Design a protein around this ligand. Structure first.
Ligand SMILES: [Cl-]
Ligand SMILES: [Cl-]
Lengths: 222, 222
């Protein structure tokens, strides 16, 4: 069956933590983080991808740059657009700018995306175990999240339905010796390495889809 | 000529913070951290390596498993053995066990190791700026280290000669406005994320080889 724990950062699928700064673009960081892992699975090369390309160019697909967006609409843009530029060639400035997509600088493609069944944490565990990092949405609107530092995050006021922040599940695990209790999702944030635990947070797992991590998960098909 | 600050975590050289638990294997975590950084430099792939393989198998080279050892004897074993297994293939259980090395699971190799000039922090600063993370030993035998939480660690009773703990220097920097004062070494520990500053500590730099950080530094040759 599935592994008791998974951590794709230990296999080379994940880039160093980034910082979206004062721009509502976490959906773009979540999408590039999922496509970075799928392109690494496919080619063996880890290449940081451009959030700014997504902020500036995916309005036609329904995103609104620094005003918000959705990872599935980003993967739809990369498919429709035929590519996505590297972080190095199309740098992040955290403000809406003119679309400067350059095909010659493209280092990634996708044909669409796969959705995890909504609200199903075991479907998400299977996707994380067999595919690589997965884009998810969560309810991050709490000071307990803003000031998180360590341990398993559990917020009684969390919603599993009304979400406001895109993040990336890079694995799952458990504390202690028993693999079926005190479980958690390993989640990469885009608030810089200085936030949380080196930029990451353990979110309580199999506790009624806490903070909505399994409500709107998806990954690009490469 | 040398950079005023360096942080290899930003360039993809460093795996997540690990936890040796109740086993005197810090020398093994220091060694795998250095070899993870040199293999990434060589291949572009960051892959977690097996501390358990070093604990269980390097007795011939003079290591003593959970009862202590040396990063240099670890690099010697990888050279004599012709390989070192991935953590994924050879998981860590924090106890001394029978060697289970399998060459088919090897993901790393080295031809020996290089020693930094002893006691010379400027030689250590140069190796850190030009090679990547460096294995070092330090005097961690004070309660102030066990309870460290943030800031620049300075322990008046520290020794630079009698060292008892292997750690990994991943960079260096300074607090405040100018580069010449309040300098520190950026150190990755192996006591899990919950210890210290999310598993890391800043040790005073250019304060007379504080805690012995430059006394016994080295890195594998890949
Ligand atoms: Cl979405
Ligand atoms: Cl040593």
């Amino acid at each position: 069956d599935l592994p008791k724990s998974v951590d794709w950062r230990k296999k080379g699928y994940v880039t160093p933590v980034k910082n979206q700064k004062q721009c509502g673009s976490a959906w773009a960081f979540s999408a590039t983080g999922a496509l970075e892992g799928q392109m690494f699975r496919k080619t063996g090369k880890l290449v940081s991808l451009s959030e700014q390309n997504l902020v500036d160019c995916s309005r036609p697909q329904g995103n609104q740059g620094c005003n918000g967006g959705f990872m599935a609409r980003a993967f739809q843009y990369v498919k429709e657009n035929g590519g996505l530029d590297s972080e190095e060639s199309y740098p992040y400035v955290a403000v809406d700018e003119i679309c400067k997509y350059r095909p010659e600088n493209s280092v990634a493609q996708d044909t669409g995306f796969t959705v995890v069944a909504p609200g199903k944490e075991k479907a998400l565990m299977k996707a994380v175990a067999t595919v690589g990092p997965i884009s998810v949405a969560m309810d991050a609107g709490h000071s307990s999240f803003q000031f998180y530092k360590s341990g398993i995050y559990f917020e009684p006021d969390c919603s599993s339905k009304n979400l406001d922040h895109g993040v990336l599940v890079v694995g799952y695990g458990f504390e202690g010796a028993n693999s079926q209790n005190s479980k958690y999702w390993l989640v990469k944030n885009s608030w810089g390495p200085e936030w949380g635990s080196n930029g990451y947070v353990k979110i309580a797992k199999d506790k009624n889809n806490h903070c909505g991590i399994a409500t709107a998960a998806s990954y690009p098909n490469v």
